[PDB]
Symmetry: C3
């Protein structure tokens, strides 16, 4: 039992912000060294961060326009990862001098990566388009690395009861979310779950922008898991009105991307519907969001991972309850999908 | 191989001092996460530091009178480790929401713990009662953690020749202990070993309280090993008299408690017979004792462990000698006891 | 890999002569073995398994007693031959079994060479790097670097010196001129040689100030030769005006490695310069600025590579080998062939 992830699907490799034109970005993804850089025309490129000569990482190399020269013996490679120049001996450039390229897709303020040996299926990139709609200082992205298996983070985000007791002022729901039985639906595309409640005051994240900050407000959490590790939490607070349409609301995306078995690249994006222009505040939010996850959620999930050791979640006979229905359905669906994928790996080997 | 310790015996889990009423003490014991806390009435309680919901440690949780709520999703548990409250959904609390409780015994200024699945046998807690007798500022406890297998520490304490060459002024025996062949007895309860000698000056630990500090003094080391890792070193210096009865003496307990294979919780307790009242000195002793073990014994035993690697002591064909008779008898008895225990486990599995 | 195999019947550099300070008890891990070294009264260096056979305490931690070592635990003493000279316990009788295994040493070229194999030593096999031992003693100097890599990655670097164009900064940079040169390489029964010649402007900083015109162009030569198990004897220098390299501001180096285990390596270097031979004030300033170049510029790439390679055997990963990789392959293969040939006549002398 060496670890198995879904291969076919689109994982978030990096925030759009993390590749600064000239910069040679490197990151480990599904246990693979990956280099990224942009070209002249902004076009992002992903390669195996590994020169095929003596296996030196390429990110350590020097950039040469839209080509990378490896820092060891200076073989250059183009964006397609064929060798453009050998400066040794006769000069002849071996057919074998190729870096494998990773199909990228730059939507929702992230670089999505296709790791599998097959051709990409841009179809499978799920539709989180509302992030791309509206004044650009409402949408913002943060990254957190955590030394845990990805499915522990998903499980946290799918069981939002935790917010009552885990989290401090910034988003605390004050014991009110826990008692609510959520409406959960399995579908062919996604797995949804909706919590509704009310508290006093409203969650600090929304309260100041409400009609009466101090006073009570109805809240809604609609989430949906999509393969391999994406969850699109929509949240907000209405006062007075029954129609949630007026709510001081928000479109979030929690996505994970495993580094290996027990490390995980955890990306978050908000897009708020309130004071949409103010980038001075947008930074102050997304910083105070990252804070909440990294400082309050981070340590519990990591603590759990340590107490769990390497042993598979269900193997430890967890005492599952009212609030664990959604996060199980996920783990099982993902499990079923992984086996189904391994099947039609050996069946696409035939066909 | 996982290593094998004796179950169905009392290991020291913590000094009585280490559990401060309100405090949620945590410690790893025989490769098990263990929480301890006191109740209103002082009563110490031991539980598997692991909420059975999602395997969050409970020590991280918030305390609620004589109950602990897990900091993740706030399931509460009583001292018996049955769940007293689920704040989610309908509210129903599964029978299955149980943390395993560890029988404790608070004698000799330690919390003794019974790790095995069976009912405790307080019979087996050996009788170190003289610690509990007398003015409370003669008795004192210290703890040292060392990154070694427990049987390496026992072996050190059973072969006290080492004090001649290992230790500095505080307790040095000046080459006089080494040449003595000790009287050793294997017994049904214990394994005893007695060194007698004389040196000049007396061991610094006793010398000032003797008739003539500078002058020679007869010394005695009576030790007895009891299962699983307890050694009850009695020591002292007489001058003039033949009868050791007058000696500036002391009742020590070396006990170990493995964290896992190659880590060990090493607890020590002195109880001196001299200037029994003076707690100002008692601290100055037990500090200068810990010093000697941690700074002089500590580094050799840890160095050895590294040089030994993972390989079983006897497997390395050690060149055993005059002074290694006691520490072998121990290792063998403990080995025999462990196998004998595993036998009647597999034979009560049949019968 | 878990069947990590080195050549046994050969001389590895255990330590720089400088690293054993008479009284001092030097310790070092060599071919996965704890090893103690110390000198005697008469300077004579001694190597032992750093491990008291009583309770397996390391001996280096012990206290020294003239030309004997007492183990710090229970004070069994041992002579330079590693037989026990004294038991201070019980009756006093010293068991035949109380022995430390001794490692044959050879103190040449400013290093302590060690013979790890169970056989008797063959001083024959210690290759001849004698020019280090010749000349004013402030031209010769030694440095040590530890790197968290398999030894054959370091050898491979030193045998493919093209890297100096792009890897290294000012102190030795060859400015893109070395790479295009196809070197003359020869396999031989003793060694594997390889010679690069070229010219650049300025000359390599290491030589330029001592040349006729520092700023002006100079012909350079790199003659190297690999000898088993991990020794490479890099000769380098710069001539101006003359065709005859005989006049060159030159140098005799030795790169040698000595594996700690699979993926750690003791890397020793010795220069011996032919210029301003007396000035020890400068000699230190050179050998420091040499160590710098290897540790700070070479070190991080070779370690980075090792990480990217993981544990997997070099050739197994299908490396894209080229004009400049001919020498470093011939080496790896020769060393490989030698190791198997050695293991063969071990299992065949086990039979007959
Ligand atoms: S490995 Fe990059 S060119 Fe040598
Ligand atoms: S994990 Fe124990 S509170 Fe849910
Ligand atoms: S272990 Fe070396 S003297 Fe006891
Ligand atoms: Fe001691
Ligand atoms: Fe180099």
């Amino acid at each position: 039992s060496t670890f198995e992830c879904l291969k076919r699907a689109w994982y978030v490799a990096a925030m759009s912000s993390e590749v600064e034109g000239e910069a040679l970005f490197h990151r480990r993804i599904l246990g693979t060294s990956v280099m990224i850089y942009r070209l002249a025309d902004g076009t992002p490129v992903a390669m195996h961060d590994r020169c095929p000569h003596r296996f030196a990482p390429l990110h350590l190399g020097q950039r040469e326009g839209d080509e990378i020269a490896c820092r060891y013996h200076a073989l250059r490679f183009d964006a397609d990862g064929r060798c453009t120049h050998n400066p040794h001996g006769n000069g002849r450039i071996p057919d074998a001098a190729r870096v494998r390229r990773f199909p990228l897709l730059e939507r929702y303020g992230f670089l999505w990566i296709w790791m599998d040996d097959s051709d990409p299926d841009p179809a499978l990139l799920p539709d989180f388009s509302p992030l791309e709609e509206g004044h650009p200082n409402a949408v913002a992205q943060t990254y957190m690395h955590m030394d845990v298996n990805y499915e522990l983070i998903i499980d946290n985000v799918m069981d939002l009861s935790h917010i009552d007791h885990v989290h401090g002022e910034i988003i605390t729901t004050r014991g009110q979310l826990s008692p609510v039985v959520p409406k959960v639906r399995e579908r062919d595309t996604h797995i949804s779950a909706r919590w509704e409640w009310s508290q006093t005051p409203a969650m600090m994240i929304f309260a100041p922008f409400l009609p009466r900050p101090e006073d009570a407000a109805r809240h809604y959490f609609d989430i949906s898991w999509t393969a391999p590790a994406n969850i699109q939490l929509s949240v907000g607070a209405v006062q007075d009105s029954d129609d949630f349409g007026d709510a001081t609301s928000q479109y979030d995306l929690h996505t994970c991307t495993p580094e290996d078995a027990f490390k995980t690249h955890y990306f978050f994006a908000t897009r708020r519907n309130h004071i949409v222009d103010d980038a001075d505040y947008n930074r102050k939010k997304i910083e105070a969001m990252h804070a909440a996850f990294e400082t309050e959620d981070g340590p519990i999930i990591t603590a759990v991972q340590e107490e769990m050791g390497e042993a598979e979640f269900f193997s430890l006979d967890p005492v599952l309850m009212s609030n664990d229905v959604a996060p199980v359905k996920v783990r099982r669906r993902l499990r079923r999908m992984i086996v189904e994928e391994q099947a039609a790996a050996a069946a696409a080997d035939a066909a």
